[PDB]
């Protein structure tokens, strides 16, 4: 390395991702204080040789050879110019391209080697689902699927699935292919209910035709108030005076776990009744009415259905 960093400025994604058979599109801009370029060489994994004071390694593009040939056919194309643009294109990209790309540039009196890492996986890597840390029932959440890839030669699509079924909601797909970031994003608005807790949400990466490429899956953690099931003995809730009545309050689902329970009779809170079992001994005709239980967790309180107790 015999370069003066004050003579060069570069703006590019410092790491780009792709997979075998796809393509990579590398946005890149630069400014050379020493003037226009006189030569550009694209190395793959360059190594500086102290003997000849030169860089050894595989040359993927040479301005003196490839820059004189019709390049529309070529796999490796330099789409830049002499003063401001260093954009690269590799179509198709191969696993052997994985490593660091060496942008060897020379002005009239200055030389520089700008390095960009290219991570190519053998298989298409999965996207990444991003969820809010807190999801509760009846809340509208934006499901975000992020893929750190985008290239013009290889269009793709992100498909949202809920329990293996494509989601009916429309998704908004956005792409960025700039010197700052390269990604494909999909956003889907979605209002989960309590029944979506524990279900599987899938974001599939597909090609332009719809062939499966990869997928990321998340198991939804959906907070919800306790869903209650109330039972009464006797079953018909019809008694006569003096008999005993037992009502129980079962939590069929709660996220997070319940913390308290109370009982109500015709809208009136039953004091000293803070367990999941209500026992009425020697019932009078005044104890007739509509009974229900209420159970609360961190989300909020829930209520069971009403039992119409009748004292004949
Ligand atoms: C450095 O300089 C180079 C060349 O001057 C610039 O490269 C151009 O970049 C633009 C995008 O920034 C490219 O436009 C895209 O073309 C894609 C298809 O390319 C066809 O056309 C080119 C010729 O223009 C052919 O060579 C090629 O074989 C194809 O036939 C489209 O798919 C793209 O459309 C997508 O993006 C647009 C928004 O940009 C959306 O509206 C579309 O819906 C779609 O999503 C896009 O139009 C252009 O092709 C590139 N030129 C060349 C010759 O390759 C670099 O941008 C520049 N670097 C910087 C950092 O500015």
Author numbering: 17 to 328
How do the authors describe this structure?
One of the best described Siglecs is CD22 (Siglec-2), whose expression is restricted to B cells. CD22 plays a critical role in establishing a baseline level of B-cell inhibition, and thus is a critical determinant of homeostasis in humoral immunity. CD22 is a single-spanning membrane glycoprotein of 140 kDa on the surface of B cells. The extracellular domain (ECD) of CD22 is comprised of seven immunoglobulin (Ig) domains (d1–d7) and 12 putative N-linked glycosylation sites.
To facilitate crystallization of CD22 ECD, we created a truncated construct that contains the first three Ig domains (residues 20–330) with five of the six N-linked glycosylation sites mutated to alanines (5A: N67A, N112A, N135A, N164A, N231A). The three N-terminal domains of CD22 are arranged as beads on a string and extend ~110 Å. As expected, d1 adopts a V-type fold. Unexpectedly, d2 adopts a C1-type fold, rather than the predicted C2-type fold. CD22 has elongated D and E strands in d2 that generate a remarkably large interface area with d1 and extensively stabilize the orientation of the ligand binding domain. As such, d2 of CD22 buries 721 Å2 of surface area on d1, which is substantially greater than that for Siglec-4 (684 Å2) and Siglec-5 (461 Å2). The N101 glycan is positioned in a hydrophobic environment at the d1/d2 junction, burying 348 Å2 of surface area, which helps explain its importance for CD22 expression. As predicted, d3 adopts a C2-type Ig domain topology. The CD22 V-type d1 domain displays unique features compared to other Siglec family members: (1) the C–C′ strands are elongated and extend into a β-hairpin (hereafter named C1 and C2) that shapes the Sia binding site; (2) strand G is continuous, without a loop insertion; and (3) the C′–D loop protrudes away from the core V-type structure. Overall, the complex and unliganded structures of CD22 are highly similar (Cα r.m.s.d. of 0.35 Å for d1), indicating that carbohydrate recognition by CD22 is largely mediated by a preformed binding site.
